DNA sequence: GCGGTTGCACCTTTCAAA
DNA sequence: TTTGAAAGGTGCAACCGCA
């Protein structure tokens, strides 16, 4: 059901302001991430 | 450094393995590169 | 140790089956 | 109505190959 990532304490430090900025968790933000990169590489060509 | 998890279904799951091979790069890396390229997108 | 990766264990919120 | 499984969320422990 999962993958891991390992990040280092800054981005996860980023990655928490940025989502508190957003109204959303860390974890919706990755996941979104995810989807908004895999679409440009399935976008390209 | 820890790892985070993040719950992903099994379709995703494929469409990483499919797009890292295709450009060169693990799982790993692409997921990684995918929240620096998205933080570059919401501090701009 | 870092990148890559597995596998988990506990948390909170959501919401239909019982 | 209650309640616990599912969904969404979080991060620790430890494997590997490597350098």
Same mark, same amino acid.
């Given at each position: +059901? +999962?993958?891991?990532?390992?990040?280092?304490?800054? +981005? &996860?430090? &980023?990655?928490?302001?940025?989502?508190? &900025?957003?109204? &959303?968790?860390?974890?919706?933000?990755?996941?979104?991430?995810?989807?908004?990169?895999?679409?440009?590489?399935?976008?390209?060509?």
């Amino acid at each position: +059901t +999962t993958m891991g990532v390992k990040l280092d304490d800054a +981005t &996860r430090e &980023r990655i928490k302001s940025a989502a508190t &900025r957003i109204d &959303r968790t860390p974890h919706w933000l990755i996941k979104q991430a995810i989807f908004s990169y895999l679409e440009q590489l399935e976008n390209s060509d």
